[PDB]
Short mmCIF file of N, CA and C in Angstrom, two decimals:
data_model
loop_
_atom_site.label_atom_id
_atom_site.label_comp_id
_atom_site.label_asym_id
_atom_site.label_seq_id
_atom_site.Cartn_x
_atom_site.Cartn_y
_atom_site.Cartn_z
N UNK A 1 1.06 -1.06 0.13
CA UNK A 1 -0.14 0.13 0.32
C UNK A 1 0.88 1.23 -0.20
N UNK A 2 0.74 1.90 -1.42
CA UNK A 2 1.37 3.52 -0.59
C UNK A 2 1.08 4.66 -2.27
N UNK A 3 1.54 5.53 -1.86
CA UNK A 3 1.57 6.84 -2.95
C UNK A 3 0.87 7.06 -3.47
N UNK A 4 1.04 8.07 -4.60
CA UNK A 4 0.35 8.07 -6.38
C UNK A 4 0.08 6.84 -7.32
N UNK B 1 6.57 -2.42 -7.65
CA UNK B 1 5.46 -2.10 -7.64
C UNK B 1 4.74 -1.48 -6.13
N UNK B 2 3.92 -0.49 -6.12
CA UNK B 2 3.58 -0.10 -4.86
C UNK B 2 3.10 -1.15 -3.76
N UNK B 3 2.80 -2.34 -4.33
CA UNK B 3 2.91 -3.06 -3.07
C UNK B 3 3.61 -3.57 -2.84
N UNK B 4 5.11 -3.61 -3.18
CA UNK B 4 6.50 -4.10 -2.87
C UNK B 4 7.21 -2.44 -2.14
N UNK B 5 7.20 -1.74 -2.82
CA UNK B 5 7.11 -0.30 -1.79
C UNK B 5 6.78 -0.11 -0.73
N UNK B 6 5.63 -0.20 -0.22
CA UNK B 6 5.01 0.03 0.80
C UNK B 6 4.90 -1.19 2.24
N UNK B 7 5.36 -2.22 1.37
CA UNK B 7 5.76 -3.41 2.20
C UNK B 7 7.32 -3.38 2.90
N UNK B 8 8.03 -2.91 1.85
CA UNK B 8 9.36 -2.46 2.27
C UNK B 8 9.64 -1.11 3.07
N UNK B 9 8.62 -0.03 3.01
CA UNK B 9 8.32 1.12 3.94
C UNK B 9 8.08 0.60 5.35
N UNK B 10 7.08 -0.18 5.52
CA UNK B 10 6.60 -1.29 6.58
C UNK B 10 7.63 -1.76 7.05
N UNK B 11 8.24 -2.53 6.53
CA UNK B 11 9.43 -3.31 7.06
C UNK B 11 10.28 -2.49 8.05
N UNK B 12 10.65 -1.41 7.09
CA UNK B 12 11.70 -0.61 7.44
C UNK B 12 11.54 0.48 8.40
N UNK B 13 11.17 1.15 8.35
CA UNK B 13 10.34 2.62 9.28
C UNK B 13 9.23 2.03 10.27
N UNK B 14 8.70 0.94 10.37
CA UNK B 14 7.68 0.64 11.32
C UNK B 14 6.11 1.57 11.01
N UNK B 15 5.88 2.59 10.03
CA UNK B 15 4.95 3.36 10.04
C UNK B 15 4.19 2.91 8.38
N UNK B 16 3.04 2.96 8.16
CA UNK B 16 2.23 2.69 6.81
C UNK B 16 2.98 3.47 6.03
N UNK B 17 3.10 3.02 4.52
CA UNK B 17 3.19 3.88 3.93
C UNK B 17 1.78 5.04 3.43
N UNK B 18 0.68 4.53 3.58
CA UNK B 18 -0.20 5.27 3.87
C UNK B 18 -0.67 4.93 5.21
N UNK B 19 -0.65 6.67 5.94
CA UNK B 19 -0.96 7.64 5.34
C UNK B 19 0.57 8.52 6.02
N UNK B 20 1.61 7.56 6.32
CA UNK B 20 2.63 8.22 6.53
C UNK B 20 3.23 8.92 5.72
N UNK B 21 3.32 8.09 4.28
CA UNK B 21 4.34 8.52 3.30
C UNK B 21 3.31 9.12 1.94
N UNK B 22 2.15 8.75 2.09
CA UNK B 22 1.12 9.11 1.10
C UNK B 22 1.27 10.49 0.84
N UNK B 23 0.94 11.54 1.62
CA UNK B 23 0.57 12.84 1.07
C UNK B 23 1.71 13.81 2.31
N UNK B 24 3.08 13.09 2.08
CA UNK B 24 3.56 14.08 3.09
C UNK B 24 4.46 15.04 2.23
N UNK B 25 5.16 16.43 2.86
CA UNK B 25 5.60 17.50 2.00
C UNK B 25 4.81 17.88 1.11
N UNK B 26 6.02 17.83 0.28
CA UNK B 26 5.49 18.41 -1.45
C UNK B 26 5.57 17.43 -2.29
N UNK B 27 6.68 16.46 -2.10
CA UNK B 27 6.77 15.22 -2.98
C UNK B 27 6.63 13.81 -2.33
N UNK B 28 6.41 13.69 -1.29
CA UNK B 28 5.62 12.24 -1.04
C UNK B 28 4.53 12.03 -1.78
N UNK B 29 4.19 11.27 -2.54
CA UNK B 29 2.84 10.82 -3.03
C UNK B 29 2.14 11.47 -4.11
N UNK B 30 2.64 12.91 -4.81
CA UNK B 30 2.22 13.54 -5.19
C UNK B 30 2.90 14.69 -6.66
N UNK B 31 4.20 14.24 -6.25
CA UNK B 31 5.69 14.97 -6.51
C UNK B 31 5.01 16.12 -7.83
N UNK B 32 5.44 17.14 -7.88
CA UNK B 32 5.53 17.77 -9.15
C UNK B 32 6.19 19.62 -8.76
N UNK B 33 6.02 19.77 -7.78
CA UNK B 33 6.77 20.84 -7.74
C UNK B 33 6.79 21.51 -6.03
N UNK B 34 7.38 22.82 -6.07
CA UNK B 34 8.17 23.11 -4.79
C UNK B 34 9.29 22.71 -4.44
N UNK B 35 9.94 22.97 -2.78
CA UNK B 35 11.13 23.00 -2.49
C UNK B 35 10.60 21.74 -1.46
N UNK B 36 11.71 20.61 -1.40
CA UNK B 36 11.26 19.56 -0.40
C UNK B 36 11.38 19.94 0.86
N UNK B 37 10.37 20.00 2.10
CA UNK B 37 10.36 20.67 3.46
C UNK B 37 11.16 20.23 4.25
N UNK B 38 12.10 19.07 3.79
CA UNK B 38 12.37 18.38 4.69
C UNK B 38 13.56 17.13 4.44
N UNK B 39 14.63 16.34 4.96
CA UNK B 39 14.69 14.96 4.72
C UNK B 39 14.34 14.17 4.10
N UNK B 40 13.09 13.92 5.18
CA UNK B 40 11.92 13.01 4.44
C UNK B 40 10.98 13.36 2.93
N UNK B 41 10.64 14.63 2.71
CA UNK B 41 10.38 15.09 2.08
C UNK B 41 11.88 15.33 0.48
N UNK B 42 12.89 15.23 0.99
CA UNK B 42 14.05 14.85 0.16
C UNK B 42 14.21 13.48 -0.64
N UNK B 43 14.02 12.89 0.64
CA UNK B 43 14.02 11.22 -0.02
C UNK B 43 13.02 10.65 -0.88
N UNK B 44 11.68 11.41 -0.86
CA UNK B 44 10.72 11.58 -1.93
C UNK B 44 11.23 11.93 -3.08
N UNK B 45 11.61 13.22 -3.20
CA UNK B 45 11.98 14.09 -4.41
C UNK B 45 13.12 12.78 -5.08
N UNK B 46 14.04 12.54 -4.38
CA UNK B 46 15.32 11.44 -4.66
C UNK B 46 14.52 10.73 -5.34
N UNK B 47 13.69 9.99 -4.75
CA UNK B 47 12.78 9.13 -5.29
C UNK B 47 11.54 9.28 -6.24
N UNK B 48 11.27 9.95 -6.59
CA UNK B 48 10.50 10.65 -8.06
C UNK B 48 11.68 10.85 -8.84
N UNK B 49 12.97 11.15 -8.81
CA UNK B 49 13.73 11.26 -9.83
C UNK B 49 14.50 10.05 -9.97
N UNK B 50 14.69 9.35 -9.26
CA UNK B 50 15.05 7.84 -9.50
C UNK B 50 13.82 7.05 -10.65
N UNK B 51 12.50 7.32 -10.72
CA UNK B 51 11.66 7.11 -10.97
C UNK B 51 11.44 7.16 -12.56
N UNK B 52 11.52 8.70 -12.49
CA UNK B 52 11.67 9.53 -13.69
C UNK B 52 13.15 9.10 -14.70
N UNK B 53 14.13 8.62 -14.06
CA UNK B 53 15.23 8.21 -15.20
C UNK B 53 14.80 6.82 -15.83
N UNK B 54 13.65 6.52 -15.80
CA UNK B 54 13.10 4.95 -16.07
C UNK B 54 12.16 5.25 -17.12
N UNK B 55 11.96 5.88 -18.09
CA UNK B 55 10.49 6.45 -18.51
C UNK B 55 9.73 5.22 -19.37
N UNK B 56 10.40 4.05 -19.77
CA UNK B 56 10.00 3.10 -20.17
C UNK B 56 9.63 2.30 -19.05
N UNK B 57 10.16 2.41 -17.97
CA UNK B 57 9.51 1.43 -17.36
C UNK B 57 8.28 1.60 -16.51
N UNK B 58 7.36 0.63 -15.41
CA UNK B 58 6.00 1.31 -14.72
C UNK B 58 6.20 0.95 -13.48
N UNK B 59 6.66 1.64 -12.73
CA UNK B 59 7.51 1.47 -11.44
C UNK B 59 6.02 0.89 -10.67
N UNK B 60 4.92 1.36 -10.84
CA UNK B 60 3.55 1.40 -9.61
C UNK B 60 3.12 0.18 -9.70
N UNK B 61 3.29 -0.56 -11.19
CA UNK B 61 2.28 -1.68 -11.53
C UNK B 61 3.45 -2.85 -11.36
N UNK B 62 4.92 -2.81 -12.01
CA UNK B 62 5.27 -3.70 -12.14
C UNK B 62 6.11 -4.24 -10.71
N UNK B 63 5.81 -5.67 -10.78
CA UNK B 63 5.96 -6.33 -9.14
C UNK B 63 7.97 -7.05 -9.56
N UNK B 64 8.67 -6.44 -8.66
CA UNK B 64 9.81 -7.03 -8.56
C UNK B 64 9.88 -8.31 -7.27
N UNK B 65 11.06 -8.76 -7.03
CA UNK B 65 11.43 -9.72 -5.73
C UNK B 65 12.38 -9.01 -4.81
N UNK B 66 12.51 -9.05 -3.75
CA UNK B 66 13.56 -8.87 -2.85
C UNK B 66 13.45 -9.71 -1.60
N UNK B 67 14.73 -9.95 -1.22
CA UNK B 67 15.27 -10.40 0.22
C UNK B 67 15.78 -9.51 1.36
N UNK B 68 16.12 -10.43 2.45
CA UNK B 68 16.58 -9.58 2.90
C UNK B 68 17.68 -10.90 3.65
N UNK B 69 18.85 -10.38 4.03
CA UNK B 69 19.86 -11.46 3.98
C UNK B 69 20.31 -10.95 5.53
N UNK B 70 19.85 -10.23 6.21
CA UNK B 70 20.07 -10.15 7.84
C UNK B 70 18.86 -9.02 8.16
N UNK B 71 19.87 -7.54 7.94
CA UNK B 71 18.66 -6.55 7.81
C UNK B 71 18.64 -5.63 6.07
N UNK B 72 19.93 -6.15 5.67
CA UNK B 72 20.02 -5.65 4.26
C UNK B 72 18.79 -6.20 3.36
N UNK B 73 18.58 -5.13 2.36
CA UNK B 73 17.75 -5.13 1.73
C UNK B 73 18.53 -5.52 0.00
N UNK B 74 17.90 -6.86 -0.90
CA UNK B 74 18.98 -7.31 -1.94
C UNK B 74 17.94 -7.61 -2.80
N UNK B 75 18.01 -7.13 -3.94
CA UNK B 75 16.88 -6.82 -5.32
C UNK B 75 17.50 -8.30 -5.72
N UNK B 76 16.38 -9.22 -6.26
CA UNK B 76 16.52 -10.47 -6.93
C UNK B 76 16.51 -9.69 -8.41
N UNK B 77 17.11 -10.79 -9.21
CA UNK B 77 17.10 -10.51 -10.93
C UNK B 77 15.74 -10.56 -11.37
N UNK B 78 15.47 -9.69 -12.49
CA UNK B 78 14.22 -9.95 -12.91
C UNK B 78 14.85 -9.01 -14.19
N UNK B 79 13.38 -8.59 -14.76
CA UNK B 79 13.95 -7.82 -16.32
C UNK B 79 15.05 -6.49 -15.67
N UNK B 80 15.02 -6.00 -16.33
CA UNK B 80 16.35 -4.86 -16.50
C UNK B 80 15.15 -3.79 -15.30
N UNK B 81 14.08 -3.67 -15.99
CA UNK B 81 13.34 -2.23 -15.18
C UNK B 81 13.00 -2.81 -13.72
N UNK B 82 12.74 -4.04 -13.63
CA UNK B 82 12.32 -4.89 -12.32
C UNK B 82 13.65 -4.31 -11.39
N UNK B 83 14.62 -4.57 -11.77
CA UNK B 83 15.95 -4.46 -11.08
C UNK B 83 16.39 -2.85 -10.86
N UNK B 84 15.94 -2.21 -11.50
CA UNK B 84 16.27 -0.89 -11.11
C UNK B 84 15.24 -0.26 -10.92
N UNK B 85 13.58 -0.52 -10.60
CA UNK B 85 12.63 0.07 -10.02
C UNK B 85 12.80 -0.42 -8.48
N UNK B 86 13.62 -2.04 -8.25
CA UNK B 86 13.86 -2.22 -6.66
C UNK B 86 14.92 -1.13 -6.34
N UNK B 87 15.90 -0.87 -7.19
CA UNK B 87 17.04 0.01 -6.56
C UNK B 87 16.66 1.06 -6.05
N UNK B 88 15.62 1.41 -6.74
CA UNK B 88 15.17 2.98 -6.35
C UNK B 88 14.03 3.03 -5.15
N UNK B 89 13.68 2.10 -4.97
CA UNK B 89 12.91 1.69 -3.15
C UNK B 89 13.57 1.64 -2.63
N UNK B 90 14.70 0.50 -2.78
CA UNK B 90 15.54 0.37 -1.70
C UNK B 90 16.12 1.73 -1.09
N UNK B 91 16.45 2.38 -1.83
CA UNK B 91 17.27 3.65 -1.32
C UNK B 91 16.00 4.34 -0.59
N UNK B 92 14.71 4.97 -0.97
CA UNK B 92 13.97 5.70 -0.59
C UNK B 92 13.61 4.71 1.43
N UNK B 93 13.39 3.70 1.06
CA UNK B 93 13.12 2.80 2.24
C UNK B 93 14.38 3.17 3.55
N UNK B 94 16.05 3.41 2.99
CA UNK B 94 16.93 3.22 3.67
C UNK B 94 16.99 4.82 3.96
N UNK B 95 16.80 5.68 2.94
CA UNK B 95 16.63 7.35 3.04
C UNK B 95 15.51 7.53 4.39
N UNK B 96 14.13 6.97 4.42
CA UNK B 96 13.13 6.83 5.23
C UNK B 96 13.69 7.02 6.62
N UNK B 97 14.05 5.33 6.76
CA UNK B 97 14.83 4.95 8.12
C UNK B 97 15.90 5.87 8.04
N UNK B 98 16.82 6.28 7.92
CA UNK B 98 17.55 7.52 8.24
C UNK B 98 17.60 9.05 8.68
N UNK B 99 15.79 9.02 8.61
CA UNK B 99 15.83 10.26 8.54
C UNK B 99 13.99 10.17 9.37
N UNK B 100 13.91 9.12 10.36
CA UNK B 100 12.34 9.05 11.10
C UNK B 100 12.80 10.32 12.03
N UNK B 101 13.55 10.24 12.59
CA UNK B 101 14.02 11.08 14.00
C UNK B 101 13.55 12.36 13.62
N UNK B 102 13.26 12.69 12.54
CA UNK B 102 12.82 14.36 11.87
C UNK B 102 11.60 13.78 11.00
N UNK B 103 11.31 13.03 11.33
CA UNK B 103 9.73 12.84 10.52
C UNK B 103 8.41 13.86 11.66
N UNK B 104 8.30 14.72 10.82
CA UNK B 104 6.98 15.86 11.23
C UNK B 104 5.79 15.65 10.79
N UNK B 105 4.42 15.65 12.10
CA UNK B 105 3.17 15.34 11.79
C UNK B 105 2.90 16.57 10.72
N UNK B 106 3.35 18.14 11.34
CA UNK B 106 2.68 18.69 10.45
C UNK B 106 2.89 19.14 9.05
N UNK B 107 3.76 18.29 8.32
CA UNK B 107 3.88 18.07 7.12
C UNK B 107 3.08 16.76 6.49
N UNK B 108 1.83 16.60 7.05
CA UNK B 108 0.86 15.71 6.67
C UNK B 108 0.05 16.08 6.05
N UNK B 109 -1.04 15.59 4.98
CA UNK B 109 -1.98 16.50 4.01
C UNK B 109 -1.22 17.03 3.76
N UNK B 110 0.04 18.03 3.43
CA UNK B 110 0.60 19.19 3.05
C UNK B 110 -0.25 19.77 2.20
N UNK B 111 -0.53 21.08 1.98
CA UNK B 111 -1.10 21.87 0.72
C UNK B 111 -0.62 22.02 -0.48
N UNK B 112 -0.84 22.05 -1.33
CA UNK B 112 -0.74 22.41 -2.52
C UNK B 112 0.09 24.05 -2.96
N UNK B 113 -0.56 24.54 -2.59
CA UNK B 113 -0.34 26.07 -2.70
C UNK B 113 1.14 26.27 -1.97
N UNK B 114 1.41 25.66 -1.03
CA UNK B 114 2.50 26.00 -0.18
C UNK B 114 4.03 25.43 -0.93
N UNK B 115 4.17 24.70 -1.53
CA UNK B 115 4.78 24.14 -2.63
C UNK B 115 5.14 24.96 -4.03
N UNK B 116 6.26 26.07 -3.65
CA UNK B 116 6.61 26.99 -5.04
C UNK B 116 7.84 26.52 -5.44
N UNK B 117 8.08 26.37 -6.41
CA UNK B 117 9.82 26.54 -7.50
C UNK B 117 9.94 25.24 -8.12
N UNK B 118 10.13 25.30 -9.47
CA UNK B 118 11.00 23.98 -10.50
C UNK B 118 12.09 23.94 -9.31
N UNK B 119 12.70 22.49 -9.10
CA UNK B 119 13.59 21.98 -8.63
C UNK B 119 14.48 21.26 -9.59
N UNK B 120 15.53 20.74 -9.98
CA UNK B 120 15.93 20.13 -11.18
C UNK B 120 16.28 18.74 -10.77
N UNK B 121 15.98 17.66 -11.09
CA UNK B 121 16.74 16.59 -10.84
C UNK B 121 17.86 16.04 -10.89
#
C-alpha cells in the first residue's frame, strides 16, 4: 500500500 | 510495484506507507513542484527522480522480488526495469529510516499552494  | 515499496516502507520504518508517506510534504505521493520541506520530503524527491530516469518502465505496477540477508535489502534478478525499480525503492526506504527522527506530523496532508518552485533532478 502506498503513494500516487 | 507499490505493493512492494509499501511493504518495504513498513518493514523499514514501522509506519504505514499510507498515511505516513502518501501525502507528506511536497514530493511524497504527488510530486510535481516546490522545494522539499525536509529530509523525508527529499527522500521522496530523490525517489521521484529515480523513477524519472526510467521513462519506459512502470514503477507502480511492475512487480519485483527482494530478500533480506540480515537487515539488508537485496534486489533479486528480474527484467532490467524490475532491478532498477527495485533499486530506487530500496534507496527511498533506507532514506526514510535514516530520517525517521525528524519525521514531522505538520507536513502530513501538506497543502499544494505551499509548494512553490521548480527544482531540477
